[PDB]
Enzyme design. Structure first.
Site, mmCIF file in Angstrom:
data_model
loop_
_atom_site.group_PDB
_atom_site.id
_atom_site.type_symbol
_atom_site.label_atom_id
_atom_site.label_comp_id
_atom_site.label_asym_id
_atom_site.label_seq_id
_atom_site.Cartn_x
_atom_site.Cartn_y
_atom_site.Cartn_z
ATOM 1 N N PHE A 32 -5.485 3.161 1.382
ATOM 2 C CA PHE A 32 -4.143 2.786 1.463
ATOM 3 C C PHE A 32 -3.997 1.569 0.560
ATOM 4 O O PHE A 32 -5.059 0.819 0.441
ATOM 5 C CB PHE A 32 -3.787 2.166 2.888
ATOM 6 C CG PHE A 32 -4.374 1.021 3.392
ATOM 7 C CD1 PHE A 32 -4.126 -0.260 3.315
ATOM 8 C CD2 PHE A 32 -5.858 1.011 3.926
ATOM 9 C CE1 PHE A 32 -4.596 -1.297 3.827
ATOM 10 C CE2 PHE A 32 -6.408 -0.003 4.422
ATOM 11 C CZ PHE A 32 -6.049 -1.255 4.443
ATOM 12 N N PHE A 88 -4.298 -0.987 -1.282
ATOM 13 C CA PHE A 88 -5.261 -2.292 -1.253
ATOM 14 C C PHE A 88 -6.221 -2.632 -0.293
ATOM 15 O O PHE A 88 -6.990 -3.446 -0.096
ATOM 16 C CB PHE A 88 -4.368 -3.379 -1.832
ATOM 17 C CG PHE A 88 -3.459 -3.104 -2.749
ATOM 18 C CD1 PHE A 88 -2.053 -3.472 -2.653
ATOM 19 C CD2 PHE A 88 -3.520 -2.351 -4.076
ATOM 20 C CE1 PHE A 88 -1.028 -3.747 -3.602
ATOM 21 C CE2 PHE A 88 -2.584 -2.019 -4.703
ATOM 22 C CZ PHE A 88 -1.330 -2.512 -4.767
#
Ligand code: HAS
Ligand code: HEM
Ligand code: CUA
Ligand SMILES: [Cu+]
EC number: 7.1.1.9
Lengths: 33, 552, 166
Positions: free
Chosen positions: C84, C86
């Protein structure tokens, strides 16, 4: 005249440069399997 | 030079525009090369060019310009102008200029968002990364122009064929024809991906796009496209370079064969980009894998045809034993050197791609710095050097403005420095890639993240300096070649140095089969249905469109 | 001359291809081989396996990080990972050693890449689709994760940890 060795020469380096690269990664491939 | 070859004028504009794009795009080369050396010279760039928002705005610009714009424009130049000169025919001048404008208005639209940090999605622009509507529309107009380049050249071909009923397609034209056809079949992926998806989305008309189908359609094209970048060089290498080398092109049949095979095998191999993709059958991956090894074949062919010509050349230039012939060649002529050193960097670029190509063996390297390392030996070296070191025979031929001693030596420097500088980058990038440094990352903004790649980071720092120098010395070159108010009373009516082509009996039988362009185009189309047919049909019944995202 | 070198070019241009083809065939024979053995686990699953990214972490297997790991065979554990914008959930992913770990991976935003530094687990993760891959960590310890498909401005900083307990 005759045979084209300089060509054969070049398509040699080439053929070896292929091998090293390939066979070489095949190594690392299994080392990581 | 204008009102009897306005095909010269219009050809020149695809080149100049071509070369603007290359400059603006390469600017970012250094800062990125320095980035992969853990030096962060972006505070500088950012201050020097105030519009740049991110590293990735630069990657976008670097890729989209150097690999979509400079190339396509250079392809369009060579693959229309060369055939037109062999046939001594003028191409349809309307449709020739339509094209040009189609690429200009295309580029301007696409750049507007790009330069405004509104489409920072890279040259692959993978959904669900969602750019500005004008970037999709832009790239779309930019590409469709190549379809006019197709029509135009198919027409030249038709016309020559009419006044020579029965006779065999002359060489450069046969090359240019299988090329345009191969590009036509190839382009269908991205054109579909656009029309059925990216445009609908970007405007507002739908709210989702399917990542698997998009990256799939997209890749049906972005493999062929590299062959599309290469062939115009390959043209030059087979049919013009032999002459400047002092010798002759040692075979017409291999040249055609090699090109044919590209028509045959350039398109059905995209699951070579999708080896790491979900939802695609191992059986079909392994299939595409093999046909990818099959596409090595032309390029392998080529090495030996070209090597042969340049040995012949050598043996004539006053050559010698095992090596001698190399010493003998016109090494003070930038137009020989540029694409020969090009081929030199191609040797290892190829052994990357076979490794790349081979399924299980591709997860050693996918999305690491190896791939950039790989392609830079391909397209940024050879294709670009050939393009570069060709200003020196083509630009006099297009303006009637001759090339000095000063400029000939300036070139020779630009050329030798762009070469080794690339060579050096390719040690670094391949090496980091092995050691697992990823591609497409602002890794000098995480100084401690990759400590175990200190060594190759030196190379990457070094490349970026060497190659900065090279680029500026190049801008120096290009602008001098074109601004000097010099005009020759004859050299413009002193055509392209086309090569003498060894030929004889056995050719007729083999050559004729190959001149069956309808049949081989049909095979090619069928090939594609086989390869992408069952995968596509399967996905299209099971569509899963996800909303878009802007993460910049 | 001249023609004494239009035959003799073709001669060894044939011979080259025999050799070009045999060779590329050996590759094909050695790749074909990796298919038969354990290493093949890292090839994604071919079978479509659709999900909804806008829910993925708020129901079904990807909801709670404390559920990621389930036993599924006599020596097999399935791990439902989430890449997702970062990051990776769970962080760290905790797995046993010497057991056939079967990752099921997806994203809720954009495409990321899932790359287990030191192994071949190098799979593209795609919103809405499920990336199934199979590996056995024979040597235990801390394995790092790098997102190697660009995913936005925090791409350079998207790392995970695989924790292979023993
Ligand atoms: C123009 C640029 C393109 C060239 C053409 C190119 C060649 C090949 N590539 Fe590639 N490539 C791959 C497979 C191949 C293969 C099989 C070849 C073949 O065309 C190779 C053929 C070349 C040879 C077989 C060498 C012949 C040598 C010659 C011709 C030199 C002769 C020298 C002489 C004669 C010296 C004479 C002078 C003297 C003085 C002696 C694969 C995998 O299957 C990947 C996926 C990586 C991944 O995981 O994403 C890939 C990744 C890329 C990407 C990254 C795309 C992206 O952004 O995702 C780009 C841009 C690219 C470009 C290009 N690639 N490639
Ligand atoms: C000034 C000389 C050049 C330098 C120093 C340079 C450097 C680089 C570096 C280090 C990268 C990788 C950055 C990353 O991993 O994100 C890159 C990306 C790339 N370069 Fe170059 N480059 C140069 C010229 C060119 C040229 C002339 C071309 C095309 C003909 C080219 C094509 C590409 C492509 C296609 C990418 C991939 C970008 C992406 O991942 O979206 N480069 N360049
Ligand atoms: Cu997630 Cu790059
Ligand atoms: Cu490709």
């Amino acid at each position: 005249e005759e045979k084209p060795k300089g060509a054969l020469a070049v398509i040699l380096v080439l053929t070896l440069t292929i091998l090293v690269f390939w066979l070489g990664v095949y190594a690392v491939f299994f080392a990581r399997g | 030079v204008y009102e009897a070859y306005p095909e010269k004028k219009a050809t020149l504009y695809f080149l100049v525009l071509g070369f603007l794009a290359l400059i603006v795009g390469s600017l970012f080369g250094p800062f990125q090369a320095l980035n992969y050396g853990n030096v962060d010279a972006y505070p500088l760039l950012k201050r020097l060019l105030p519009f740049v928002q991110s590293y990735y705005q630069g990657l976008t610009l670097h890729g989209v310009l150097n690999a979509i714009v400079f190339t396509q424009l250079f392809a369009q130049a060579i693959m229309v102008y060369l055939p037109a000169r062999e046939l001594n025919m003028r191409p349809n001048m309307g449709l020739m200029w339509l094209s040009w404008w189609m690429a200009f208005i295309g580029l301007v639209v696409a750049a507007l968002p790009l330069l405004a940090n509104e489409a920072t999605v890279l040259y692959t622009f993978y959904p669900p990364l969602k750019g500005h509507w004008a970037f999709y529309l832009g790239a779309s107009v930019f590409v469709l122009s190549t379809w006019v380049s197709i029509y135009i050249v198919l027409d030249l071909w038709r016309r020559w064929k009419a006044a020579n009923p029965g006779k065999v397609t002359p060489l450069v034209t046969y090359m240019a024809v299988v090329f345009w056809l191969m590009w036509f079949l190839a382009s269908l992926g991205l054109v579909l991906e656009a029309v059925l998806f990216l445009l609908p989305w970007s405007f507002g008309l739908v709210e989702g796009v399917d990542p698997l189908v998009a990256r799939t359609l997209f890749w049906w094209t972005g493999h062929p496209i590299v062959y599309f970048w290469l062939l115009p060089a390959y043209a030059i290498i087979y049919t013009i370079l032999p002459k400047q080398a002092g010798g002759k092109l040692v075979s017409d049949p291999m040249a055609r064969l090699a090109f044919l095979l590209f028509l045959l095998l350039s398109t059905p191999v995209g699951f070579h980009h999708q080896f790491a993709d979900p939802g695609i059958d191992p059986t079909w991956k392994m299939i595409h894998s093999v046909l990818t090894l099959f596409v090595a074949v032309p390029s392998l062919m080529t090495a030996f045809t070209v090597a042969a010509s340049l040995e012949f050349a050598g043996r004539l230039r006053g050559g010698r034993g095992l090596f001698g012939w190399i010493r003998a060649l016109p090494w003070d002529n930038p137009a020989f050197v540029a694409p020969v050193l090009g081929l030199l960097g191609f040797i290892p670029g190829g052994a990357g791609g076979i490794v790349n190509a081979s399924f299980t063996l591709d997860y050693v390297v996918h999305n690491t710095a190896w791939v950039p390392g790989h392609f830079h030996l391909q397209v940024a070296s050879l294709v670009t050097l050939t393009a570069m070191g060709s200003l020196y025979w083509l630009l006099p031929n297009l303006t009637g403005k001759p090339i000095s001693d000063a400029q000939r030596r300036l070139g020779l420097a630009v050329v030798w420095l762009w070469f080794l500088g690339m060579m050096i980058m390719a040690v670094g990038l391949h090496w980091a890639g092995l050691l697992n440094v990823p591609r497409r990352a602002y890794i000098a903004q995480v100084p401690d993240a990759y400590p175990h790649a200190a060594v190759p980071m030196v190379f990457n720092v070094l490349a970026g300096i060497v190659l900065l120098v090279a680029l500026l010395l190049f801008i120096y070159g290009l602008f001098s070649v074109l601004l000097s108010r010099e005009r020759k009373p004859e050299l413009a009516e002193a055509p392209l140095p086309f090569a003498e082509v060894i030929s004889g009996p056995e050719d007729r039988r083999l050559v004729l089969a190959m001149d069956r362009i309808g049949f081989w185009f049909a095979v090619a189309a069928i090939l594609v249905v086989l390869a992408y047919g069952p995968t596509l049909v399967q996905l299209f019944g099971h569509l899963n469109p996800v909303p878009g995202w802007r993460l910049w | 001359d001249e023609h004494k070198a239009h035959k003799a070019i073709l001669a060894y241009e044939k011979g080259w291809l025999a050799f070009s083809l045999a060779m590329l065939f050996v590759f094909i024979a050695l790749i074909a081989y990796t298919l038969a053995t354990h290493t093949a686990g890292v090839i994604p699953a071919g079978k479509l396996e659709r999900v909804d990214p806008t829910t993925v972490r708020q129901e079904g297997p990807w909801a709670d990080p404390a559920q990621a790991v389930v036993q599924t065979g006599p020596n097999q554990y399935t791990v439902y990972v989430l890449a997702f914008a970062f990051g990776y959930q769970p962080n760290p992913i905790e797995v046993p050693q010497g057991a056939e770990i079967v990752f099921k991976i997806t994203s809720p935003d954009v495409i990321h890449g899932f790359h287990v530094e030191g192994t071949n687990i190098n799979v593209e993760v795609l919103p809405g689709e499920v990336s199934t891959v199979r590996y056995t960590f024979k040597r235990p310890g801390e394995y790092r994760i790098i997102c190697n498909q660009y995913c936005g401005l925090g791409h350079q900083n998207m790392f995970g940890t695989i924790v292979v307990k023993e």
